[PDB]
Design a protein around this nucleic acid. Structure first.
Ligand SMILES: [Zn+2]
Ligand SMILES: [Zn+2]
Length: 92
RNA sequence: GUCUCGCUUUUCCCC
């Protein structure tokens, strides 16, 4: 009676950014050490972003060949902080 | 366009 919600699921809290230099063929670090993500031809990459695997983000993937991005522990933590900010509802 | 995407939340609300 005093709240509202988006018609569709908000993917913005599950997406991670693709490296600017990886998209140019100029980056020189593995996905594990770079500041951003290095997806494959099989990932659902769009507009320099990819939706990350929820099960992997929680520390235990539940598939064997999933279409989402698997980020390193530091980026998993940044993604969970972005998710938690909605549970905390800091904006309201 | 599976792109409204296979998981969309760590519990009201967010979603
Ligand atoms: Zn890079
Ligand atoms: Zn996975």
């Amino acid at each position: 009676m005093a709240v509202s919600v988006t018609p569709i699921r908000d993917t913005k809290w599950l997406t991670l950014e693709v490296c600017r230099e990886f998209q140019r063929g100029t980056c020189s670090r593995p996905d594990t050490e770079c500041k951003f993500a290095h997806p494959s031809k099989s990932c659902q990459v769009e507009n320099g972003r990819v939706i990350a695997c929820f099960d992997s983000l929680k520390g235990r993937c539940s598939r064997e060949n999933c279409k989402y991005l698997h980020p390193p522990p530091h980026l998993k933590t940044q993604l969970e902080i972005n998710g938690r900010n909605n549970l905390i509802q800091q904006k309201n």
